[PDB]
Amino acid sequence: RPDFCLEPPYAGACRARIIRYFYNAKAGLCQTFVYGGCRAKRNNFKSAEDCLRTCGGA
C-alpha cells in the first residue's frame, strides 16, 4: 500500500470545515475528518470509495 496512506490525517491551519476521508492504517478502514481547506496532504480523499481504492490494498 502507498506509504502516504500510513500518515495521520492533516487538518491544516485554515478555518474551513470540509468533511474528508483518510485511511486509518491501524483500523484498516477509511474514516472521516474535518479538513481546514488548505495544504492538504495525500491521505485526504473526497469519498470513501476513492480512499479504499487507493489505500485499502495490501
- The CATH number of whichever domain residue 26 belongs to comes to 4.10.410.10
Resolution (A): 1.4
Rounded CA-CA distance 16/5 in Å is: 23
C-alpha cell at 57: 490494498
Rounded CA-CA distance 34/10 in Å is: 9
Domain that holds residue 23: 1-58
Number of structural domains found in the chain: 1
Could you tell me which of 8, 58, 1 has the C-alpha nearest to residue 35? 8
Rounded CA-CA distance 25/17 in Å is: 23
Local structure of 35: helix, strand or coil: strand
Q: Centre a 10 Å sphere on the Cβ of residue 23 and count the other Cβ atoms it contains.
A: 24
Helices (H), the chain: 48-55
Residue type, 22: F
- The DSSP letter of residue 28 is T
Contacts of 13 (CB under 8 A, 6+ apart): 36, 38, 39
